[PDB]
Amino acid sequence: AEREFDMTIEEVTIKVAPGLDYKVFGFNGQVPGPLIHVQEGDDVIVNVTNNTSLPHTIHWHGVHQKGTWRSDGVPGVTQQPIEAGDSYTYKFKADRIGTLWYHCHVNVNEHVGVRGMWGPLIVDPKQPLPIEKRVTKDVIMMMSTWESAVADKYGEGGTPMNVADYFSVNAKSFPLTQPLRVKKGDVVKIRFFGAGGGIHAMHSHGHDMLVTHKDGLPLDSPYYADTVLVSPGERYDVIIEADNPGRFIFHDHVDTHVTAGGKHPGGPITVIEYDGVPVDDWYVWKDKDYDPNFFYSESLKQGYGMFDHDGFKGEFE
Amino acid sequence: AEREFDMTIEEVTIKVAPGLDYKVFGFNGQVPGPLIHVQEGDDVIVNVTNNTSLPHTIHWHGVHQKGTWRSDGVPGVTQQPIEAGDSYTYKFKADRIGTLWYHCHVNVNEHVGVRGMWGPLIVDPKQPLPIEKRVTKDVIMMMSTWESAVADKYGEGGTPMNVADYFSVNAKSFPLTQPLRVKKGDVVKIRFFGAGGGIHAMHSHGHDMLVTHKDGLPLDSPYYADTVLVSPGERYDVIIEADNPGRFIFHDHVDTHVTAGGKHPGGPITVIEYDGVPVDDWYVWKDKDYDPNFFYSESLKQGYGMFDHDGFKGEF
Amino acid sequence: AEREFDMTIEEVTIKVAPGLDYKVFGFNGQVPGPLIHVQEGDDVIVNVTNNTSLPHTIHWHGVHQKGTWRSDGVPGVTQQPIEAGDSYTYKFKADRIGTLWYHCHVNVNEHVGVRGMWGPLIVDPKQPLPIEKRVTKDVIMMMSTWESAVADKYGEGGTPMNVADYFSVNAKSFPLTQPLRVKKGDVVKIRFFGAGGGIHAMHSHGHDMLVTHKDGLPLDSPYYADTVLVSPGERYDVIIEADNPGRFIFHDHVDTHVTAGGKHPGGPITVIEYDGVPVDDWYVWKDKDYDPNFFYSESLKQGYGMFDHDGFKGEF
Ligand SMILES: [Cl-]
Ligand SMILES: [Cu+2]
Ligand SMILES: [Cu+2]
Ligand SMILES: [Cu+2]
Ligand SMILES: [Cu+2]
Ligand SMILES: [Cu+2]
Ligand SMILES: [Cu+2]
Ligand SMILES: [Cu+2]
Ligand SMILES: [Cu+2]
Ligand SMILES: [Cu+2]
Ligand SMILES: [Cu+2]
Ligand SMILES: [Cu+2]
Ligand SMILES: [Cu+2]
C-alpha cells in the first residue's frame, strides 16, 4: 500500500528526570518521535517540515533504499540538509522487515546523542516467526543518555569532553518511567534500541529473554539471555513468557547508568508488574499516574500508520 | 534438597592492588563473596545478618523466583531493605540452571560498582552438556573496577563523575592476581562475570575459547572466540582445551584496563601456566606465593554448599 | 611454505586528522603496520629490529604458538623485551586460520592504544566458506582512538585519566579516510578489527552485512546485522552483496566517535561509492584524491608475504 505521512521537527523542552528539563528537536514535538508502523512492501512517503532554527535530515536506519538512495537522509552524501523553515520529501519501499528506526543525520553527536531526534519504524513481515504470532503485547524501549550541562543550549554537546550524567528509556529517567504491566500468560515482545551514544545492559528480573532478532532480522539460532547488551545503532527483539507473577524490576545493569545527576536511583528502570499481585504500601510505584502507552504498546495494536503519543510531548516556548 | 546457609555482611578493607586498599561491604567479610553451589531443583534458604552501618539486600541474579518474588531482593519493589544490625531470610527454588550470581540491590552504583557486594551462585543442571562431562577444572573470573578517590569512604562512588582507575579479576589487580595453573590435557571451563560497571574484553593467548553458555544457559550454536566481551550483569561460560604447553597470558584487552592508578601493567591479568614448563629467571611470577583457589577451582570440587575462601577475606 | 621477512620499528609522525599530527611507533614506519598475508600451515619467520628509543615486542594475536610459546611476544612472560637498537626473531606456524593481527605487548595501553603498534595478519584457510569463494573485494578496517593531548609525547597516554578525542579507521579520521569503491554485483568481504582501546558500532547504510566469522573463525550460525559492535581485541568478518547502487555512508554509530577534537563530522567514516552513480556538486568527496589500497584491498590480491603501503607511511 502507499502510506504517506506528514512530520514536523519542533523546538520543545521535555522533562527527562526530576529537575532535568532538556531542550530537544522533537519530531512532531515529542521524544521518542512518532511511531511509524507499516507492512513489508509498502511504499512510504514522508513529508518533513523543519520548524526549528537549525538544519536537519531524516535517515531511515535499516531501510535499504533500494534504488532510492537519494532518500537516505545523509547531508553531503545523499542530499543537502533541510534548512530551517524548509521542507523535504522522503520516498522508499519498506522491503526490509523488522525493528527499524529513524533519526537525524546532521550534527549527529549532538542531535541524536542529546536532542532526541529519533523514533521507531516497525515493518511487519508478511511472514512472521511462529512465536511472533503468540505475542500479546509489543513493547518499544529506546535507550539514550543526556548531558545536563548542555540541557538549555542547542548547538553544544555530544562530545568526549561532555559528561553524560542522566540515562533513560523512552526519554525518561526512573522514577518518571512507567511500569510494564502484564498478566500471567502474556507473551511479551520487547524491542530494544540503542538510540543514543551509550551502551545499555538490559536485565529482566524474574525471567529469561529469548533473543529472536538482531537489527530486525530473525536469528537462525535464537538464544536465551537474562542481560542483553545494546549499543548505538543496534536493535534486539526478545520474547518474555509472562508466566511468573511478581513485581520484577527490568533495568540497565551498567552501574553508573542507574543514577541521575550523581544520585541513585535513576536511569533506565521499569518494573514488570503483574496484574494479580497485591500492592504493598511500601511499593515505590503504588498509585503511579499510569501511562499504558509509555512503550508504544497501545499504538502498536492500532493498525498501520503514524502515531503520536502525548506522554512523549514536550513544551513549546 | 533443602540447603540452608547463613551469610553476614561485614565492613572490611581489602587489598586490591599495590597502592590500593579499599573499604568494602564483604559478604562473609570477603570479596568475591562466598561461592554458593547447589543443584537444579534445590530449595535454598539464606539467612542474612547485616553487620554493617548501612542498609543492604541480596538479589539473586538469574534466579527466576518462581512463586517467591518476595525473595528477589529489590528494595522498594520486593522488600524493604535489611537495615543495619537486622536480619532477613531469602528462600527460593533453584530451578534455573547455570552460572548465576548474587549482589546487593541497594545503592547499586556504589555497593556493587565499588564495594564488592557480589559473589557467584552456581546451579548444576541435573543434565549437563556433553562438553561439561569432559571438564577437569572449573574456574570463576569476576571482573570489576575501582575508583581510588572513594576507597576510604562509604557513601560515595559509582557515578559518571568518578574515575575508575583500577581494574580486577576476583578483586585483585595484577601482579596480585594469581596464575591459572593447568596440566596438558586439562579441559578447563571458565565462567566470566561482569560483576562491576565496566566492559571487559577477555582474551586468552595460546588458545581459542569455545563459548558454550550465555548467562548460564547453553547455546544451541556454540562458537569459538579468542576475545569474549563481558559487560555488566552478563556471564559467559567457555571451554579451553589445555593442549598447548607454555606460559600464556590471559587478560582484559581493553587498553586502559591493563593499568593501575595510571601505571602499567595492572588490571585483570592472569597467566595460564602449564605444569612442567621451565621457569625463566625473568618470569614475572617466578616464585609466586600461589593460591590454588583464587578462581574458586578447589571449592568448586567440594560439592554443594556455601564456601568461604581465606584468600578473599578482608581485614576489620 | 616458509615465509620469512624483516620488520622494523620506527619513530615517525603520521597525520590522523586535519590539524592532528601524531607521534607513533610504526612497524616499518607506517600505521597500520604492514599487511602479512599467508596460507594455513605456513611457517613464518619474522626478523624484527627496534629502531626506536624504547623497548617493544610483537605479539601475534590469534596465533596459537603451538609448541612455540616463546614466540608469543609477551614481556616478562615469554621473552625479555626487544631493547632499543636490538633485534629479535619470531618463528611460528600459521595453523590458525582467518583474520588475525599483531601488536606490541609492552606498555600496551599507550603503545597499542595511541602509538599505532598494530597491523593485520590474514591466514587464508585451506577450505574457505563457499561465500568466501565468491568475494571480489577484501577490505581491512582497523579501528582505533587517539588522545590529542599526548600526540607529541611518547611515554604518556592510554590511561583512564586521558581523553580520547579523535577516532579513526586505518589511522585516518574523516574526511582524510578514503571511500570504499565498488561496482554493482561485487561481493565484499570486510574484516573489522578492534585495534585500539575503544568500542565501535560499525553500521553500513543501504545494505545488511552477513556476519560470517568471529575472531577469524567461521560461525556455524552466521547472522545478518546492520550494525556490528567491535571491541578491543575482537575481529568480525562480514559479507556485503553490492547490489544497491548509490552513495551509502558506512561508519561508527557511537555518537561521540563521529567527532574530531570536539568538531563534527570526523571519525571512522567512509562511503560505499558505486561506479556509475552521478556525482552532485555538493558531494563531500567529489574531488577525492583516491587511494585504492586504503583498506589493503590491492595488497590482498598480490600473493603471500609482507606488504608495506606508502599511504600509511609516517615522516621521520
Ligand atoms: Cl497476573
Ligand atoms: Cu538534526
Ligand atoms: Cu542509525
Ligand atoms: Cu543507517
Ligand atoms: Cu537488578
Ligand atoms: Cu548494599
Ligand atoms: Cu544483577
Ligand atoms: Cu537480576
Ligand atoms: Cu595479550
Ligand atoms: Cu611497544
Ligand atoms: Cu591482542
Ligand atoms: Cu593475544
Ligand atoms: Cu549513518
mmCIF file of N, CA and C in Angstrom, chain B residues 163-165 167 199 201 203 205-208 221-229 241 243-249 251 253-256 258-259 261-264 271 277-278 280 282-285, chain C residues 59 61-67 69-70 72 74 76-80 96 101 103 105-109 112-113 158-161 195-197 199 214-215 217 219-221 229 231-235:
data_model
loop_
_atom_site.group_PDB
_atom_site.id
_atom_site.type_symbol
_atom_site.label_atom_id
_atom_site.label_comp_id
_atom_site.label_asym_id
_atom_site.label_seq_id
_atom_site.Cartn_x
_atom_site.Cartn_y
_atom_site.Cartn_z
ATOM 1 N N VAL B 163 36.155 8.509 38.715
ATOM 2 C CA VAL B 163 37.133 7.986 37.754
ATOM 3 C C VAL B 163 37.491 6.564 38.136
ATOM 4 N N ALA B 164 37.138 5.595 37.286
ATOM 5 C CA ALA B 164 37.582 4.201 37.613
ATOM 6 C C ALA B 164 39.011 4.050 37.118
ATOM 7 N N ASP B 165 39.931 3.894 38.057
ATOM 8 C CA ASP B 165 41.357 3.879 37.735
ATOM 9 C C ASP B 165 42.052 2.595 38.148
ATOM 10 N N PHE B 167 41.354 -1.921 38.135
ATOM 11 C CA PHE B 167 40.581 -2.932 37.431
ATOM 12 C C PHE B 167 41.007 -4.296 37.963
ATOM 13 N N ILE B 199 33.201 -2.788 31.044
ATOM 14 C CA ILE B 199 33.208 -3.809 30.000
ATOM 15 C C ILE B 199 34.632 -4.397 29.928
ATOM 16 N N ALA B 201 37.164 -7.166 27.789
ATOM 17 C CA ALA B 201 37.333 -7.982 26.565
ATOM 18 C C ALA B 201 38.322 -9.071 26.896
ATOM 19 N N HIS B 203 40.714 -12.017 26.698
ATOM 20 C CA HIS B 203 41.469 -12.658 25.598
ATOM 21 C C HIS B 203 42.482 -13.636 26.163
ATOM 22 N N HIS B 205 45.652 -15.858 25.364
ATOM 23 C CA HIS B 205 46.752 -16.213 24.422
ATOM 24 C C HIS B 205 46.835 -17.729 24.331
ATOM 25 N N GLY B 206 47.372 -18.210 23.213
ATOM 26 C CA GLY B 206 47.758 -19.583 23.032
ATOM 27 C C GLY B 206 46.635 -20.544 22.758
ATOM 28 N N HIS B 207 45.370 -20.067 22.839
ATOM 29 C CA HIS B 207 44.210 -20.950 22.831
ATOM 30 C C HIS B 207 42.990 -20.173 22.328
ATOM 31 N N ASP B 208 42.117 -20.890 21.610
ATOM 32 C CA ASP B 208 40.759 -20.368 21.438
ATOM 33 C C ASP B 208 39.856 -20.860 22.571
ATOM 34 N N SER B 221 24.062 -22.979 19.425
ATOM 35 C CA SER B 221 25.157 -22.827 18.449
ATOM 36 C C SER B 221 26.370 -22.207 19.148
ATOM 37 N N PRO B 222 27.139 -23.040 19.816
ATOM 38 C CA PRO B 222 28.361 -22.545 20.453
ATOM 39 C C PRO B 222 29.313 -22.045 19.382
ATOM 40 N N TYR B 223 30.218 -21.169 19.760
ATOM 41 C CA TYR B 223 31.126 -20.556 18.774
ATOM 42 C C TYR B 223 32.484 -20.330 19.430
ATOM 43 N N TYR B 224 33.527 -20.386 18.599
ATOM 44 C CA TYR B 224 34.848 -20.084 19.079
ATOM 45 C C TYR B 224 35.135 -18.607 19.058
ATOM 46 N N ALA B 225 35.975 -18.225 20.031
ATOM 47 C CA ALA B 225 36.425 -16.839 20.163
ATOM 48 C C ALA B 225 37.813 -16.810 20.741
ATOM 49 N N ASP B 226 38.637 -15.826 20.441
ATOM 50 C CA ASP B 226 39.847 -15.628 21.234
ATOM 51 C C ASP B 226 39.644 -14.419 22.157
ATOM 52 N N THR B 227 38.586 -13.628 21.982
ATOM 53 C CA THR B 227 38.316 -12.469 22.814
ATOM 54 C C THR B 227 36.825 -12.438 23.084
ATOM 55 N N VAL B 228 36.416 -12.486 24.343
ATOM 56 C CA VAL B 228 34.997 -12.505 24.723
ATOM 57 C C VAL B 228 34.681 -11.226 25.465
ATOM 58 N N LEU B 229 33.753 -10.418 24.927
ATOM 59 C CA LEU B 229 33.340 -9.196 25.583
ATOM 60 C C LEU B 229 32.319 -9.506 26.666
ATOM 61 N N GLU B 241 40.655 -26.144 25.758
ATOM 62 C CA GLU B 241 41.399 -27.381 25.738
ATOM 63 C C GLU B 241 42.857 -27.046 26.035
ATOM 64 N N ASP B 243 45.864 -27.948 25.554
ATOM 65 C CA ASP B 243 46.708 -28.877 24.793
ATOM 66 C C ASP B 243 47.930 -28.178 24.206
ATOM 67 N N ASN B 244 48.338 -27.056 24.766
ATOM 68 C CA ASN B 244 49.412 -26.271 24.169
ATOM 69 C C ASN B 244 50.342 -25.760 25.266
ATOM 70 N N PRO B 245 51.253 -26.595 25.764
ATOM 71 C CA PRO B 245 52.009 -26.186 26.932
ATOM 72 C C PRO B 245 52.891 -24.967 26.714
ATOM 73 N N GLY B 246 52.877 -24.058 27.685
ATOM 74 C CA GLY B 246 53.651 -22.838 27.660
ATOM 75 C C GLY B 246 53.218 -21.980 28.837
ATOM 76 N N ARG B 247 53.599 -20.714 28.799
ATOM 77 C CA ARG B 247 53.023 -19.704 29.712
ATOM 78 C C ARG B 247 52.302 -18.693 28.838
ATOM 79 N N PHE B 248 50.968 -18.636 28.989
ATOM 80 C CA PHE B 248 50.125 -17.864 28.072
ATOM 81 C C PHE B 248 49.285 -16.867 28.869
ATOM 82 N N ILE B 249 49.572 -15.599 28.671
ATOM 83 C CA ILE B 249 48.804 -14.558 29.433
ATOM 84 C C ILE B 249 47.361 -14.571 28.986
ATOM 85 N N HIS B 251 43.911 -12.029 29.658
ATOM 86 C CA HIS B 251 43.705 -10.680 30.241
ATOM 87 C C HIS B 251 42.596 -9.920 29.540
ATOM 88 N N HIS B 253 41.511 -7.090 27.309
ATOM 89 C CA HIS B 253 42.158 -6.423 26.175
ATOM 90 C C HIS B 253 41.758 -4.980 26.048
ATOM 91 N N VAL B 254 40.890 -4.463 26.873
ATOM 92 C CA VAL B 254 40.594 -3.030 26.855
ATOM 93 C C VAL B 254 41.810 -2.268 27.367
ATOM 94 N N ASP B 255 42.393 -1.446 26.456
ATOM 95 C CA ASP B 255 43.729 -0.906 26.715
ATOM 96 C C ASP B 255 43.863 -0.199 28.046
ATOM 97 N N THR B 256 42.918 0.642 28.416
ATOM 98 C CA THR B 256 43.055 1.398 29.675
ATOM 99 C C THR B 256 42.862 0.513 30.887
ATOM 100 N N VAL B 258 44.426 -2.335 31.521
ATOM 101 C CA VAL B 258 45.652 -3.012 31.975
ATOM 102 C C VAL B 258 46.603 -1.956 32.572
ATOM 103 N N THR B 259 45.951 -1.103 33.367
ATOM 104 C CA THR B 259 46.678 -0.092 34.147
ATOM 105 C C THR B 259 46.185 -0.144 35.585
ATOM 106 N N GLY B 261 46.051 2.826 38.694
ATOM 107 C CA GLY B 261 46.444 4.162 39.154
ATOM 108 C C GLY B 261 47.285 4.864 38.093
ATOM 109 N N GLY B 262 47.027 4.605 36.810
ATOM 110 C CA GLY B 262 47.737 5.318 35.729
ATOM 111 C C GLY B 262 49.008 4.631 35.253
ATOM 112 N N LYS B 263 49.430 3.565 35.931
ATOM 113 C CA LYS B 263 50.665 2.865 35.591
ATOM 114 C C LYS B 263 50.425 1.466 35.062
ATOM 115 N N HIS B 264 51.303 0.949 34.228
ATOM 116 C CA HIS B 264 51.171 -0.320 33.524
ATOM 117 C C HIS B 264 52.354 -1.158 34.001
ATOM 118 N N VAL B 271 47.930 -15.640 34.040
ATOM 119 C CA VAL B 271 48.764 -16.399 33.112
ATOM 120 C C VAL B 271 48.290 -17.833 33.205
ATOM 121 N N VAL B 277 56.598 -26.615 32.469
ATOM 122 C CA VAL B 277 57.347 -25.671 31.573
ATOM 123 C C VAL B 277 58.414 -25.010 32.422
ATOM 124 N N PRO B 278 59.699 -25.049 32.029
ATOM 125 C CA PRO B 278 60.749 -24.455 32.849
ATOM 126 C C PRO B 278 60.519 -22.952 33.072
ATOM 127 N N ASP B 280 61.692 -19.337 33.572
ATOM 128 C CA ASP B 280 62.828 -18.474 33.254
ATOM 129 C C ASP B 280 63.138 -17.519 34.402
ATOM 130 N N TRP B 282 63.636 -14.476 34.381
ATOM 131 C CA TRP B 282 62.990 -13.183 34.238
ATOM 132 C C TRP B 282 61.472 -13.315 34.283
ATOM 133 N N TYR B 283 60.917 -14.500 34.516
ATOM 134 C CA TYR B 283 59.458 -14.622 34.561
ATOM 135 C C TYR B 283 58.884 -13.790 35.717
ATOM 136 N N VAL B 284 57.932 -12.934 35.425
ATOM 137 C CA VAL B 284 57.350 -12.041 36.446
ATOM 138 C C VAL B 284 56.821 -12.794 37.646
ATOM 139 N N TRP B 285 56.288 -13.999 37.463
ATOM 140 C CA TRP B 285 55.681 -14.730 38.592
ATOM 141 C C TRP B 285 56.553 -15.894 39.054
ATOM 142 N N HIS C 59 53.426 -9.362 19.630
ATOM 143 C CA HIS C 59 52.522 -10.466 19.903
ATOM 144 C C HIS C 59 51.644 -10.707 18.661
ATOM 145 N N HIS C 61 48.370 -11.966 17.607
ATOM 146 C CA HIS C 61 47.054 -12.183 18.270
ATOM 147 C C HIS C 61 46.227 -13.114 17.428
ATOM 148 N N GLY C 62 45.888 -14.265 18.040
ATOM 149 C CA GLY C 62 45.112 -15.293 17.363
ATOM 150 C C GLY C 62 46.008 -16.480 16.996
ATOM 151 N N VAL C 63 47.330 -16.250 16.933
ATOM 152 C CA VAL C 63 48.277 -17.324 16.596
ATOM 153 C C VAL C 63 48.443 -18.189 17.855
ATOM 154 N N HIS C 64 48.228 -19.478 17.743
ATOM 155 C CA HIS C 64 48.233 -20.337 18.961
ATOM 156 C C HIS C 64 49.629 -20.483 19.521
ATOM 157 N N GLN C 65 50.649 -20.391 18.653
ATOM 158 C CA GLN C 65 52.018 -20.665 19.090
ATOM 159 C C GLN C 65 52.145 -22.106 19.615
ATOM 160 N N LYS C 66 51.603 -23.056 18.838
ATOM 161 C CA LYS C 66 51.594 -24.438 19.215
ATOM 162 C C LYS C 66 53.041 -24.932 19.212
ATOM 163 N N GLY C 67 53.535 -25.239 20.399
ATOM 164 C CA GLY C 67 54.893 -25.661 20.705
ATOM 165 C C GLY C 67 55.879 -24.527 20.499
ATOM 166 N N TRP C 69 55.530 -21.262 22.240
ATOM 167 C CA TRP C 69 55.097 -20.209 23.152
ATOM 168 C C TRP C 69 56.168 -19.145 23.358
ATOM 169 N N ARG C 70 57.461 -19.432 23.228
ATOM 170 C CA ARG C 70 58.499 -18.422 23.370
ATOM 171 C C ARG C 70 58.507 -17.391 22.243
ATOM 172 N N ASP C 72 55.490 -15.902 21.572
ATOM 173 C CA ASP C 72 54.220 -15.198 21.771
ATOM 174 C C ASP C 72 54.350 -13.704 21.969
ATOM 175 N N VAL C 74 55.312 -11.718 24.751
ATOM 176 C CA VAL C 74 54.805 -11.074 25.968
ATOM 177 C C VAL C 74 55.978 -10.836 26.903
ATOM 178 N N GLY C 76 58.321 -10.404 29.971
ATOM 179 C CA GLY C 76 58.228 -10.908 31.356
ATOM 180 C C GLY C 76 57.454 -12.215 31.485
ATOM 181 N N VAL C 77 56.899 -12.701 30.381
ATOM 182 C CA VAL C 77 56.130 -13.947 30.401
ATOM 183 C C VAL C 77 56.756 -14.920 29.381
ATOM 184 N N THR C 78 56.961 -14.493 28.137
ATOM 185 C CA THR C 78 57.539 -15.389 27.130
ATOM 186 C C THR C 78 58.893 -14.914 26.596
ATOM 187 N N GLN C 79 59.257 -13.676 26.840
ATOM 188 C CA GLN C 79 60.585 -13.175 26.460
ATOM 189 C C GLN C 79 60.918 -11.973 27.306
ATOM 190 N N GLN C 80 62.211 -11.621 27.249
ATOM 191 C CA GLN C 80 62.624 -10.296 27.671
ATOM 192 C C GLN C 80 62.306 -9.333 26.525
ATOM 193 N N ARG C 96 46.376 -21.505 12.674
ATOM 194 C CA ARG C 96 45.075 -20.920 12.995
ATOM 195 C C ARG C 96 44.653 -20.022 11.856
ATOM 196 N N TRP C 101 45.786 -10.597 13.929
ATOM 197 C CA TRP C 101 46.504 -9.311 13.877
ATOM 198 C C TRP C 101 47.716 -9.411 14.754
ATOM 199 N N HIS C 103 50.539 -6.950 17.384
ATOM 200 C CA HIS C 103 50.682 -5.672 18.037
ATOM 201 C C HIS C 103 51.783 -5.777 19.088
ATOM 202 N N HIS C 105 53.369 -5.751 22.753
ATOM 203 C CA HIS C 105 52.803 -6.152 24.046
ATOM 204 C C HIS C 105 53.570 -5.564 25.215
ATOM 205 N N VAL C 106 54.375 -4.552 24.953
ATOM 206 C CA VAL C 106 54.964 -3.700 26.005
ATOM 207 C C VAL C 106 54.134 -2.419 26.169
ATOM 208 N N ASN C 107 53.968 -2.002 27.415
ATOM 209 C CA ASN C 107 53.237 -0.732 27.648
ATOM 210 C C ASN C 107 51.970 -0.566 26.828
ATOM 211 N N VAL C 108 51.143 -1.623 26.757
ATOM 212 C CA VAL C 108 50.140 -1.733 25.695
ATOM 213 C C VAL C 108 49.126 -0.598 25.725
ATOM 214 N N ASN C 109 48.766 -0.129 26.918
ATOM 215 C CA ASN C 109 47.772 0.959 26.997
ATOM 216 C C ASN C 109 48.184 2.144 26.174
ATOM 217 N N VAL C 112 49.805 0.319 22.024
ATOM 218 C CA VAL C 112 48.702 -0.133 21.171
ATOM 219 C C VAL C 112 47.591 0.916 21.177
ATOM 220 N N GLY C 113 47.314 1.507 22.344
ATOM 221 C CA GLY C 113 46.212 2.458 22.440
ATOM 222 C C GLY C 113 46.403 3.685 21.564
ATOM 223 N N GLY C 158 46.931 6.781 27.164
ATOM 224 C CA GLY C 158 46.351 5.480 27.297
ATOM 225 C C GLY C 158 45.919 5.156 28.707
ATOM 226 N N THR C 159 45.589 6.152 29.517
ATOM 227 C CA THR C 159 45.061 5.803 30.833
ATOM 228 C C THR C 159 43.663 6.350 31.004
ATOM 229 N N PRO C 160 42.944 5.910 32.025
ATOM 230 C CA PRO C 160 41.604 6.453 32.325
ATOM 231 C C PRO C 160 41.573 7.981 32.466
ATOM 232 N N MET C 161 42.713 8.560 32.792
ATOM 233 C CA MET C 161 42.773 9.985 33.093
ATOM 234 C C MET C 161 42.901 10.778 31.795
ATOM 235 N N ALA C 195 41.344 -2.501 17.101
ATOM 236 C CA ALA C 195 42.787 -2.380 17.282
ATOM 237 C C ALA C 195 43.137 -1.551 18.474
ATOM 238 N N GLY C 196 42.359 -0.476 18.726
ATOM 239 C CA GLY C 196 42.658 0.415 19.866
ATOM 240 C C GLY C 196 41.805 0.093 21.076
ATOM 241 N N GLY C 197 41.677 1.077 21.972
ATOM 242 C CA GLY C 197 41.004 0.851 23.253
ATOM 243 C C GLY C 197 39.537 1.147 23.215
ATOM 244 N N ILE C 199 35.295 1.069 21.676
ATOM 245 C CA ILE C 199 34.269 0.231 21.105
ATOM 246 C C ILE C 199 33.664 0.959 19.908
ATOM 247 N N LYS C 214 33.877 -14.794 13.622
ATOM 248 C CA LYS C 214 34.209 -14.122 14.881
ATOM 249 C C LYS C 214 35.645 -14.493 15.175
ATOM 250 N N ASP C 215 36.497 -13.485 15.315
ATOM 251 C CA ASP C 215 37.927 -13.660 15.621
ATOM 252 C C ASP C 215 38.594 -14.585 14.595
ATOM 253 N N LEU C 217 37.306 -17.129 12.942
ATOM 254 C CA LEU C 217 36.779 -18.489 12.802
ATOM 255 C C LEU C 217 35.347 -18.433 12.306
ATOM 256 N N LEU C 219 31.512 -18.874 11.815
ATOM 257 C CA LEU C 219 30.366 -19.207 12.662
ATOM 258 C C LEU C 219 29.543 -20.304 12.039
ATOM 259 N N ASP C 220 29.116 -21.262 12.867
ATOM 260 C CA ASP C 220 28.172 -22.248 12.413
ATOM 261 C C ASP C 220 26.834 -21.618 12.085
ATOM 262 N N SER C 221 26.456 -20.567 12.761
ATOM 263 C CA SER C 221 25.206 -19.837 12.559
ATOM 264 C C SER C 221 25.483 -18.384 12.218
ATOM 265 N N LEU C 229 28.988 -4.471 16.589
ATOM 266 C CA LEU C 229 29.783 -3.903 17.684
ATOM 267 C C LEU C 229 31.140 -4.587 17.705
ATOM 268 N N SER C 231 34.834 -4.550 19.731
ATOM 269 C CA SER C 231 35.507 -4.105 20.946
ATOM 270 C C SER C 231 36.982 -4.485 20.897
ATOM 271 N N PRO C 232 37.794 -3.954 21.835
ATOM 272 C CA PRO C 232 39.232 -4.192 21.750
ATOM 273 C C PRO C 232 39.591 -5.652 21.710
ATOM 274 N N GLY C 233 40.434 -5.991 20.702
ATOM 275 C CA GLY C 233 40.947 -7.344 20.512
ATOM 276 C C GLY C 233 40.146 -8.145 19.527
ATOM 277 N N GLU C 234 38.860 -7.797 19.348
ATOM 278 C CA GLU C 234 37.974 -8.632 18.524
ATOM 279 C C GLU C 234 38.192 -8.391 17.050
ATOM 280 N N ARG C 235 37.823 -9.412 16.256
ATOM 281 C CA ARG C 235 37.615 -9.216 14.807
ATOM 282 C C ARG C 235 36.266 -9.785 14.438
#
